[PDB]
Amino acid sequence: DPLWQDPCCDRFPKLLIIGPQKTGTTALYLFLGMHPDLSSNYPSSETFEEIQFFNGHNYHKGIDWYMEFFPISDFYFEKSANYFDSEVAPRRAAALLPKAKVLTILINPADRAYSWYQHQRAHDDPVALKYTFHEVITAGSDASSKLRALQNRCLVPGWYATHIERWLSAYHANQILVLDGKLLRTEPAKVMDMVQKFLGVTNTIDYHKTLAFDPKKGFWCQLLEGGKTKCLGKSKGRKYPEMDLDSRAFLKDYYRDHNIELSKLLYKMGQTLPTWLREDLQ
Ligand SMILES: Nc1ncnc2c1ncn2[C@@H]1O[C@H](COP(=O)(O)O)[C@@H](OP(=O)(O)O)[C@H]1O
């Protein structure tokens, strides 16, 4: 395992959206790319919009492998929801891009866990298709290894504070931005504003004016000519049943403490507490 150091250049991302998954990363990624001054990486035929360099096996491929993803607009960014959870990504990223901006998006952990479950079912994951949500989150003494594994993938990434500390040890607080996932989905133009301000955007664009709520889609989309909308794909904003109330409550109890710690950490980081977080904490 190596540790690519800062080569200095201009062909490197200046912002990293580390996830986690199912928090609205693709939407932030899509809306940000709309700003004429900000440019995303080119898609991978294996990981699509994501690069996934710092997290796992792709990192030992070298710096040039990474640089190729970016154009040769003068501010690039990449998104890999796998970075948030990654243990090694923080220091590996800090070593190569010490001055990079780090952005993360948080939604209620319970819904984030539910979305992952629904996500694995959509991709026809057998363990996810075989067990119900409650069975996954309460997987126990009679639970299989695969079932247990799916539970970890639903719940662990939701220990927001734990992972944010790993990134906070590799990056200064003023180089990190914790977004409200609920606000991004409910009022995207509001967070698109905080992001721009956070990136030091010279010519701020108003998204209120050129985004729009698509009722048949149930989410915001890009406003085009004459009412028209360009929304995210079918795999984004999947149509499934509201999560069980008992399951919700069960998870509410489980994260209570994680959420207490998060509230303290963010405050200490100088980040505004997410709406969903204030409610859960009351
Ligand atoms: N404008 C938007 N259009 C579509 N989905 C959006 C959205 N803003 C937020 N989302 C949310 O972001 C999730 C996907 O996140 P990610 O890109 O990190 O995997 C969605 O999955 P759901 O399909 O479970 O509702 C959805 O709730």
Q: What is the DSSP string of 3-36?
A: -------TTSEEEEE---TTSSHHHHHHHHHTST
Please state the φ and ψ torsions of residue 106, each to the nearest 5 degrees: -120, 135
How far, CA to CA in Å, does 207 sit from each of 32, 54, 203, 281? 10, 31, 13, 30
Contact 4, 63 (CB under 8 A): yes
Residue 118 CA: nearest ligand 1 atom is: 24
Is the Cα dihedral 205, 209, 210, 213 positive or negative?
positive
The DSSP element (H or E) to which 56 belongs, if any, is: none
Residue 106's beta-bridge partner residues? 180
Residue 115 is assigned to a ligand binding site:
yes
22 included as an active-site residue: yes
Helix-helix angle 160-168:245-269, to 10 degrees: 20
CA–CA separation, 84 and 93 (whole Å): 12
Per the entry, the structure determination technique was: X-ray
Residue 175: count of CB within 10 angstroms of its CB: 19
Dihedral of the alpha carbons of 129, 132, 133, 136, in degrees to the nearest 10 = -80
Residue 231 CA: nearest ligand 1 atom is: 3
Pocket residue to mutate for ligand 1, from 17, 18, 22, 32, most atoms within 8 A of Cβ: 22
Residue 62 is assigned to a ligand binding site:
no
Pocket flag, ligand 1, residue 238 (CB < 6 Å)? yes
Question: How remote is the C-alpha of 276 from its chain's centroid?
Answer: 16
Ligand 1 atom 10: residue of nearest CA: 24
Instruction: Look at residues 75, 99, 84, 69 and name the one whose alpha carbon lies nearest to residue 22.
Output: 84
Ligand 1 atom 25: residue of nearest CA: 237
Q: How far is ligand 1, taken at its centre, from the CA of residue 89, in Å?
A: 24
Residue 25 is assigned to a ligand binding site:
yes
Ligand 1 atom 27: residue of nearest CA: 237
Structure tokens at 185: 């989905």
Instruction: Look at residues 135, 155, 214 and name the one whose alpha carbon lies nearest to residue 22.
Output: 155
What residue ranges define each of the domains in the chain, with the CATH number in brackets? 1-282 (3.40.50.300)
Residue 166 is assigned to a ligand binding site:
no
Resolution limit, Å: 2.3
Please pick, among 22, 79, 101, 182, the residue that the annotation labels catalytic: 22
Pocket flag, ligand 1, residue 181 (CB < 6 Å)? no
The Cα angle at residue 267 between residues 54 and 174, in degrees rounded to 5: 50
Residue 105 CA: nearest ligand 1 atom is: 18
Residue 221 CA: nearest ligand 1 atom is: 1
- Residue 1, burial from CB neighbour count under 10 angstroms (0-12, 13-18, 19+): exposed
CA–CA separation, 263 and 261 (whole Å): 5
Ligand 1 atom 11: residue of nearest CA: 24
Q: How far is ligand 1, taken at its centre, from the CA of residue 224, in Å?
A: 20
Residue 22 is assigned to a ligand binding site:
yes
First to last CA, the chain: 45
- Residue 85, burial from CB neighbour count under 10 angstroms (0-12, 13-18, 19+): buried
Ligand 1 atom 23: residue of nearest CA: 237
Pocket flag, ligand 1, residue 84 (CB < 6 Å)? no
